[model samples]
Target: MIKQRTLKNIIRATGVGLHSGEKVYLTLKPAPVDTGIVFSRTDLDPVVEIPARAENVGETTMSTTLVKGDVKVDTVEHLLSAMAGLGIDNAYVELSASEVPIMDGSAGPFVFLIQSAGLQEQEAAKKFIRIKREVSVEEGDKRAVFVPFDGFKVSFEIDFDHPVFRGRTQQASVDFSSTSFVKEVSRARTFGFMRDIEYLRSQNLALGGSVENAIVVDENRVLNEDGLRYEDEFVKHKILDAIGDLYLLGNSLIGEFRGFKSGHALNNQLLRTLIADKDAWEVVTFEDARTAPISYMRP
Candidate 1:
């Protein structure tokens, strides 16, 4: 039986926000069962807690940002992805800023922090949202679909057309029980184009971006002194982001995710559509021996 899990101890770290460019402190703490993943802004006079859910997603142009009332937390995909990857069912994340630290523009930093805190399984069983039918969303040439699968698997394809990405395609499939999230997708740094940096800066964005935090590409080649972490790090980061975004569904998904040039918007749209259809998915606890793990079944 799969039991609910959370951190065993508190862990803390500090870094600069991707957009705000301000240094922020983040702490991870254990939460009671069924608390889900909640973010608290400690900088505010009266702290505000926002549940990490798709409905709270206020913006997805470049990064996924969640908002409630006048408080908002930006660039949350990496941390959320780390939590999802580690199978954390409930956690309380406390932050001193409006945005999460964009450490190396990847989920690696969060993975490290969470690992340091340690993980403890709770008595309550973990619940999974099992897909019963296909759910898909499209945005122009981009599309994302989820189909019934026994375990969680995802495949992503990115078509950048630029020289850096010309004729490059990367596909990965991992069974959650065998693959470590840190090894599979955590170190992939986010990427941006040189042409977009100036406009992003002018608009007061990407203030914490540099070659160290992201892969900056030009018309001819990558600007970073170091080479790519993975030849397909670009698309891999997209899958990383999608994992985090889909985690906002509040439960781990039991399905195969197929994403084609999909981003935050389309990913959230797919989740909304799935939620709107009651017959699309079912919530099941993992403790039942009679019911096999989602991985035992296939669409």
Candidate 2:
């Protein structure tokens, strides 16, 4: 059987929080088998442990936030996506603030950090939540769906009426066998409309957002001095966010995810619905001899 995995050693990094504008330090350490992913708030007097799971998710406004008792962590998608895409089964993440550092508004930074720490295979086998039936969730024009597949894949479609993204719809099928997430999806940065910044600031949000961390879209053009990372980066970022949100299932998923203009809320809802219906999924382990190795299995 393919063994469960964790970091070979602890690693640390620092960056600015997307919303708080505060410089935050983050540390990643190996955790015991079956501990899942746990986030600890080192800034608090008494450290808090918040499991990175769907039910622990408390807010999805501008980003996905998880809460446990009184402790809260904001803008966790980037880090979570990195962990999931890399097939990390157990980790203990300690943050120095309420929000995780934005780290260039992409998963690239976290990916580098995790890789630097190194990955270790444990004695226990890795568990996967295999989708058994189709399940979906919708919010107005946005929707997310999960369907049974031999392995994991994602298809995302984004529709923005603005000049930059109009008439642009992209879909990518990532079979774990050949997908290179760091090159294909990790660098796709988050984006925001210029017109929405004022309103978001009024609500005490996006305090640290700037052209440096996100693609700023105005009515007629992109404000970034450097152009887009990829012509279809908008949709790719959606896929990146979906990876993070879906990972909250507490185990890697062995299925296909299809999304259309879906955001954090819809993705979280999809997980809730799928878990509520026992017929939708079940936990299973990867037996290396009998199962095909996932793409990320290679270093």
Candidate 3:
């Protein structure tokens, strides 16, 4: 838990981009210590490397997009969520298209890829940003907040008044100290409303989104034949997305995050607010992994 880690070997996959709807080739490569999670657009002339940092986030309409100069990598939250879940500190994400493939609209596939690639512990210690004070951001009815905690945790509440979400758990929490991200959060897929599909398509988003990649719900019930992954899959997926969005801080966090109807935009705003305040957080490293407050373990 104390040492930094990266991939053991390169991994690659191909799928359709959520927005571009184009065939995309993606690669995950081991990076040196302190490299953090960086994305490389391999298709462009003079490949652009975009660091997955909050400041680099240029768009958050339905997904988080990291932009560096004119180059961009879209819908990065799921892949980032997987890295966060696995406690991966450094890696190179090479994409031959603008968006990362929406594999089943969850972090499960990415988790599998990383596990198959294996993890290599680095010589240096891992860094964590420990929250020192409460930081919160609100946009109308939406809110995202972070507070000091000994371990990484997340609490989320969603308000979707649709019939499909009725009789379901609307709020949930996960303390990594005693929770499994891969089992409890990673398989919860991104969801969309059938009613909004046309508008999203008109906006040039969710072009590759289908029942195969996302949970599509009509006015009354889920369109996916398999139904929900969890009774409260909606809120869990929100938690999953938040973990990835928060990872844009370029390091893991030792804090508790709370979200109420918060999405990518609000999550990024909270991170920016936290960084703008110098006294809100401090970088810390554990000399002994056993003494660390939280440990990410595979089951």
The best candidate in terms of TM-score: 3
Deviation (Å) of 189 in candidate 3: 0.2
Error of 2 at 132 (Å): 0.9
Each prediction's TM-score against the native? 0.94, 0.96, 0.98
> What tens-digit string does per-residue lDDT give for candidate 2 at 101-126?
99899999889988887898888988
So what's the TM-score on candidate 2?
0.96
Error of 1 at 229 (Å): 1.3
Top candidate (lDDT): 3
Across 195-251, the per-residue lDDT of candidate 1 in tens digits comes to 898899888789989887899999989989888888778877988998999999999
lDDT of model number 3: 0.93
The residue ranges of model 3 lying beyond 4 angstroms of the native Cα positions read none
lDDT for residue 71 in candidate 2, whole number 0-100? 77
lDDT of each: 0.86, 0.87, 0.93
In candidate 3, what are the lDDT values of residues 130-167, reduced to their tens digit? Answer: 99999999989999999999999999999988999778
Global Cα lDDT for candidate 2: 0.87
